[PDB]
Amino acid sequence: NVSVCGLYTYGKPVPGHVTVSICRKYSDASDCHGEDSQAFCEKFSGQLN
């Protein structure tokens, strides 16, 4: 479970949409190579409650 919520005053559950994106990017990437760093990526999305 990964709960996410953006509330303008922390007491006001707002509507909208949100996407939690998570990606095995690297252990000790240098990024002078210029290739894309993400190893894995498992994107989940959901409209706000």
Binding site: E35, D36, Q38, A39, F40, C41
Partner: protein, 49 residues
């Protein structure tokens, strides 16, 4: 039966990335009212460009 089955798959979910590694292809061609399903590994050896 019309024309043929076709398919159109996207390379994004496959993450066509540099350290996203080679692919292999193998098709489960199931047969109706016989059940003796065939599998075939054709085109499988991907092409590391």
């Amino acid at each position: 039966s019309h024309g043929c089955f076709y398919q159109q798959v996207k390379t994004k979910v496959f993450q066509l990335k540099r350290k996203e590694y080679e692919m292999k292809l193998h098709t489960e061609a199931q047969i109706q009212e016989e059940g003796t399903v065939v599998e075939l590994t054709g085109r499988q050896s991907s092409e590391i460009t």
